[PDB]
């Protein structure tokens, strides 16, 4: 398509980004997101799709790397994805990532509730330091 001089549709890039996440290819998914920015598209929706695919396909470690890059880059995630990332990290014993995200969630403008605190506490209660 690029070699033919045609401009890929925003939906076309989203199909490739979602496919990359299903295989756990976070590097390719991030390369395609960079192309969408270069094509002047809106990468917020495609970034959201990439993170949920990695979480769904048990690539939580890769999902955290992609999510934090978008969140630190200024993008604001959806409330459902915020609750997904915090909960999945705390179920896996990853307090460091779950605390990083919840700090970014509040910086965006979404204040943590009892649900998010209960996720962090589930890991803090097992560290041996009350």
């Amino acid at each position: 398509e690029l070699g033919a001089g045609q401009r890929p549709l925003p939906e076309t890039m989203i199909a490739l980004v979602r496919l990359s996440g299903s295989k756990g290819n976070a590097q390719r998914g991030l390369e395609l997101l960079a192309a969408m920015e270069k094509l002047n598209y809106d990468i917020r929706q495609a970034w959201l799709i990439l993170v949920e695919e990695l979480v769904r396909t048990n690539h939580l470690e890769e999902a955290n790397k992609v999510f934090l890059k978008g969140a630190r880059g200024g993008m604001r995630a959806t409330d459902q994805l915020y609750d997904l990332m915090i909960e999945e990290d705390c179920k896996a014993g990853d307090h460091s990532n779950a605390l990083d995200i919840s700090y970014e969630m509040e910086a965006a403008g979404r204040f943590a509730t009892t649900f998010h605190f209960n996720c962090l506490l589930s890991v803090q209660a097992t560290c041996g330091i009350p």
């Binding site: 549709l9 925003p10 939906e11 979602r18 809106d42 929706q45």
Partner: protein
Amino acid sequence: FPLFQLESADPDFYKIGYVRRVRAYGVEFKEGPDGFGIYASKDIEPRRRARVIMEIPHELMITIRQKHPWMFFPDIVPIGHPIFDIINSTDPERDWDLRLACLLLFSFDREDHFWRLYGDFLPAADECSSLLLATEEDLAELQDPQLVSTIRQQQKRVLEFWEKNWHSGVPLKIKRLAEDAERFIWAVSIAQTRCISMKTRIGALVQDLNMMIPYADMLNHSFEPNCFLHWRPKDRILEVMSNAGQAIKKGEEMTINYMPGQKNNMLMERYGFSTPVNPWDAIPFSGDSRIHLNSFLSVFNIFGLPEEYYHDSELSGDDSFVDGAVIAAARTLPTWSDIDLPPIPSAERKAVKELQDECRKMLAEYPTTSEQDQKLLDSLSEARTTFATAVKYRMHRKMFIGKIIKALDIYQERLL
């Protein structure tokens, strides 16, 4: 060499606020046949942060708590005044406009109150576009039985409140506020069309207020505003701030979003106006025929999530077609989506054709068209403000349905 090379409002309009610490920066108040407005008096260059456009001190406002108990900020009603009993007898949920109207009429009676002066720049009974002032013949031009019944209930509720509380036995200090029902109806119309509800912190007390804010109730509505309101708790000043990073040209109108997410029938019930580019307006489709949501959004460069749909105006160049109506079309059209399944063009044409037929069936319900309504407005010479408002409302809905037929035609061809 230099040798060889909408009317401004009353100058006293800004001055009465200015001597009481109202500040306006780079904007001017201009008056036209349709009313007051706020316009950029110069090119407002973008900055890293929101620019202060107007500052309105708290003491010039009329505010009441949204939630019971009714406290007034600033407190202007004396202890024991019979007006508090009238305010206190209202329904806490529905009668916020009656409470504000009583405060407004009470404020006009006070010699020292600012709204004694500011009230002279409020629209009169024959100039306010509120449907509370509409006659039964004006409601006949709406062509919306649901909205008409809503207005009739509002007019009945407002009138019954006046008859109950302004009977013959009330004190003179109450009678002189609303000597006639039309005076009280006008006050409720001012309350509905101009009330600004915000969460404020005053001192240490955070509460929701219904506020009558002078000079900020001159900002017109836009669903793509270039300004927003911001309460500054430390000095009790309402700020009108232009959007951060947004360049505003000289003469551009300064607008705020009165009612995010609200349809034109809600804008008509509250503020007595409607917009043809309302991005939340809906149209009842059968759902038998559906188009591809992803394709429709990408054809018109509508990006974002459904609740934050916006037009990437830099991806169209000069396509003036896409506006709030097409965004409203995306939200109201029957759509299907299957993650990344593409749509068959021949099956989408059948849906587009059937959707266009259903759009024309609804236009045929209206006795006149949107062009015939537009020339009716131009031909008016002795029409009430609400009559023209009622005609603009039905024309806007026709313009919206007509935009959907145009958008579907473009979408069907751009799918090749």
